[PDB]
Amino acid sequence: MRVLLIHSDYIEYEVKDKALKNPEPISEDMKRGRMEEVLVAFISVEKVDEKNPEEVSLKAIEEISKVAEQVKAENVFVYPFAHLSSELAKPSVAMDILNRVYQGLKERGFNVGKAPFGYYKAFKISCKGHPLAELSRTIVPEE
Amino acid sequence: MRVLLIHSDYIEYEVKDKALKNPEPISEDMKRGRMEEVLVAFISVEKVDEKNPEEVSLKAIEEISKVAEQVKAENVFVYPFAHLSSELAKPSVAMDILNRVYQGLKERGFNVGKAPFGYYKAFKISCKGHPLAELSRTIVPEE
């Protein structure tokens, strides 16, 4: 897994066309969203993550929480984002892990939003300028 | 080299703290910038690019131009962005290549903007939702 963490004044998205034939099933509330004062976690789920979805997710949950604690973010947004790696996971495993991370973060007491997997999305973001406001993390299972 | 190409209604930045000890020397006009209706090229210059800075840059110039032609963008923005790879180039070579790409794109008749290398930057972007509006490219020299 590769994660890009961006501490942002806001994130906003609107689901547009489908990018896969079998994308994530969505409800009407899921086709747009906005959070403010938010650590946006852009996530690429990778092939090696398929060895241990649970271990990878837990490690991601810990890393994302730690950065949110550092920048004092109470809001986290899980934004699926394939472009951080070419070594991508099967879409079913990607969704599995994205969900594990999303749920895990709520279980830690954050307010967490998400964008659905497998659609093209318009999105707006404003990245605060700070040293810890734009970070990247590599998280992989122990083999 | 890894490039993330985002067709955007706008990009905007404001240079904040320095992220390196020897960043790119900047003038006062360089510390903020805005373009609209713009193909934003987020660029990670990689270690393997040091074998042939010229060849890599030319390949990048061609790929970025082609995408701008597809989405009919007349404005391009070169945004240095280390997070697309862990296999990073020496900062001097990174700046060399970023400049080659920037200049090359102007020589093709685009209006081109850039953000300086080596600073933390606040930035705002709005990505159009379209299928070709958020793309990634790997460009490396032939060995």
Swiss-Prot record, chains A, B:
UniProt-reported outcome of changing residue 120 to A: Isolated domain has nearly wild-type deacylation of mischarged L-seryl-tRNA(Thr), no longer binds L-Ser or L-Cys. No activity on threonyl-tRNA(Thr). Same results
Impact noted for substituting residue 83 to A: Isolated domain has decreased to no deacylation of mischarged L-seryl-tRNA(Thr). Deacylates correctly charged glycyl-tRNA(Gly)
Subcellular location: Cytoplasm
UniProt-reported outcome of changing residue 121 to S: Isolated domain does not deacylate mischarged L-seryl-tRNA(Thr)
Family recorded in the similarity comment: Belongs to the class-II aminoacyl-tRNA synthetase family.
Assembly: Homodimer.
Domain statement: The N-terminal domain (about residues 1-143) is an archaea-specific tRNA-editing domain that has a highly similar structure to Dtd (D-aminoacyl-tRNA deacylase); the domain binds L-serine and L-cysteine and most D-amino acids but not L-threonine. Editing of incorrectly charged L-seryl-tRNA(Thr) by this domain is tRNA catalyzed.
Protein's name in the database: Threonine--tRNA ligase
Species, as recorded: Pyrococcus abyssi (strain GE5 / Orsay)
Range covered out of full length: 1 to 143 of 625
